[PDB]
Design a protein around this ligand. Sequence first.
Ligand SMILES: Nc1ncnc2c1ncn2[C@@H]1O[C@H](COP(=O)(O)OP(=O)(O)OP(=O)(O)O)[C@@H](O)[C@H]1O
Ligand SMILES: Nc1ncnc2c1ncn2[C@@H]1O[C@H](COP(=O)(O)OP(=O)(O)OP(=O)(O)O)[C@@H](O)[C@H]1O
Lengths: 376, 374
Amino acid sequence: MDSVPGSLVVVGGTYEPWLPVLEKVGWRCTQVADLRKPDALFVETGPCIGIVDLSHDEFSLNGIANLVSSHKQVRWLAFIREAQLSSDTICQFIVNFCIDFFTAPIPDAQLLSTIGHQLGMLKLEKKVWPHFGSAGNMGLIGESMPMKRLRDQIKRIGPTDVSILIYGESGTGKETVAKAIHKTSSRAQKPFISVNCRAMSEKRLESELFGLGETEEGQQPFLLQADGGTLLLNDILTLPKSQQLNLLRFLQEGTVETRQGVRAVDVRILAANSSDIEKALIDGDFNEELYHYINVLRINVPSLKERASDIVLLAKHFLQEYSKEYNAQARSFSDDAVRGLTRYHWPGNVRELMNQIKRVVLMSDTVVLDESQLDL
Amino acid sequence: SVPGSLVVVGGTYEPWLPVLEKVGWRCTQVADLRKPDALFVETGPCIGIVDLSHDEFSLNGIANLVSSHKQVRWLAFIREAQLSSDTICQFIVNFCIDFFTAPIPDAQLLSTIGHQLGMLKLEKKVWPHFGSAGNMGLIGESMPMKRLRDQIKRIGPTDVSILIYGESGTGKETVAKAIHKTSSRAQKPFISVNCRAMSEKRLESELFGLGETEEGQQPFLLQADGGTLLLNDILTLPKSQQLNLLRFLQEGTVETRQGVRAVDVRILAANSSDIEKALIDGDFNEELYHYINVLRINVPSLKERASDIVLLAKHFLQEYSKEYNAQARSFSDDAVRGLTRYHWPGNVRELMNQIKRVVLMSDTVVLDESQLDL
Ligand SMILES: Nc1ncnc2c1ncn2[C@@H]1O[C@H](COP(=O)(O)OP(=O)(O)OP(=O)(O)O)[C@@H](O)[C@H]1O
Ligand SMILES: Nc1ncnc2c1ncn2[C@@H]1O[C@H](COP(=O)(O)OP(=O)(O)OP(=O)(O)O)[C@@H](O)[C@H]1O
């Protein structure tokens, strides 16, 4: 036979009754007491099933609900066991999903019925859980301390095919982030379309949602191509009213217009921002309904000003990359030069950095790059 | 009364429907995808089945709705034709509790639902009431308020830590006082904390205590024991204090002059800033964040509630006018079609403050638009 382990947290060992009914029917039972232990146990066991002994007992109700959605999220299914207390706050605490509960006696055959419904999910969890982004894709442009948070954040919000708001300062790598969560999105093998729109006129911009290729003159709406995959919208607030309409229409109906008949698609939508969004909102300028459609999740891309310990490593890569790309003899920075570039403010962040270095490298006549050839 | 919704444009996929209809359940069905959103945001606690059957809706918009703000108030559930389990099994990241096989064990589906239906029957403990079972809306009463009411009613009693978010000057503490009423510790003391204007050393002297207090000293937790403590402008906390906070948040213990002791305090926190920006930059311990972000509540600014502006100003008028004998008794329609049009960055606070100012200047009984923002 083949099955899946399952743990249970309780100080009262003698509270077996429901335990041997599962071991004999084939369940890998594990039991924790001291409250702090199961966290490590749950984070190491991976996807499983946990039973919560509520029978008055001795646990902090805050810490409980905390654990419930700490990192033990979808990968863990909630379930409680109580001594018949459905009345006060305690049963209102079953707002934490919990799927079902346990009568104080032993609903012998009913117990499997309660459990059996959920079992299809754990064997489903195992099919999707191994992934883990194995290759440790060290933020394909940066790697420091605020960055590791970003990875973890990106890794857990990636697969969730919801719309996410990406915000940070200009030239930080919001697009770089967008491309990264597309790999995580589980629609990774599908196309990805970043769009530095800006330099588009309404007519031409409007030509994206319903087209103005009069007669099939080699023209296809952008939304269409991004079907199954991911589309990115850059500098979004610059959008005109009429197009924001079509977006919300599309965001609600998922349909687009083509000359060869109106059609529907399946595109996960992302958005980037660097401006004071709230200031636009209050005046009336931005449709708030649309904001709630997109602000389902937020991710903040930290500027170079935030990280600073990244500045050195970034320059090295940008050195290596551009020097190798153009055969340049420049291969290293002096300790002098290193101990100066970080002090710069870098308003344009990642963008400006590569751009600046790009120039210096193509101007660099030496192998070691001094401060004289840089910020001048 | 009866929840039980299911989303699909077609219909002939009854088979699992009459098993509910014939057993006596009012099933409700949505098609145009956009409609259930408004429906889900207004219905409150219920159960929704998402029929996707590999021929229905775009999984982005779906997962969006599923996790827009329709979170705990709704339990997820899907329907597929077996011949489908493949590309997006990951959409079951939203709990979803269970799914629907193509074979239909007529009794098993009821077994899956009936056990889960009992959880919705727990929501019945507050009995939806609709008609504002609280203090007329504590401070407001419009459309985002009724959700807020519904929201407060179901997340209130749960003595877990909750993160309160809205814009500045909205009335976040008023909510805490309001949800404390729903809590099972209502008869206990309540202590608000404006964490904005406090120094580290003195802050540390509030928890486990510091300084050199060989005189007279008593911690908030002690006073707040059994009751509820609220933290306003929480992100303003220094590193060293967030440490001590988490210490308590894990152990529930404090230090006092008369020896160290432990307590049982439900903890709340208020915020008006960009929460996502603080965590990533490093300013707030994320571990600590999950201890408090167990539940979220969104306090709607005046920008959302345009129909509240009229009702809000009137209430604040009567109360303060009476307090200072003011002759002012009403607003002109002129003033009305100006107060609503205003942006109100400071929201409820600013509204209360401005009117408060005007009243002390109002020499007339009728208040015209000229006497307002002055
Ligand atoms: N016209 C362009 N052509 C080719 N590559 C470009 C162009 N513009 C930017 N890039 C590349 O984008 C990469 C980084 O992504 P990006 O600049 O979009 O991040 P971002 O600045 O945070 O996003 P945003 O577009 O919102 O400003 C840079 O390495 C740059 O080479
Ligand atoms: N000791 C106190 N106990 C109970 N209530 C108090 C006490 N002191 C003040 N209050 C009231 O609590 C409210 C707190 O105002 P506050 O500025 O914190 O609201 P807020 O909108 O949540 O703040 P913020 O703009 O930082 O978000 C005040 O209106 C005040 O009347």
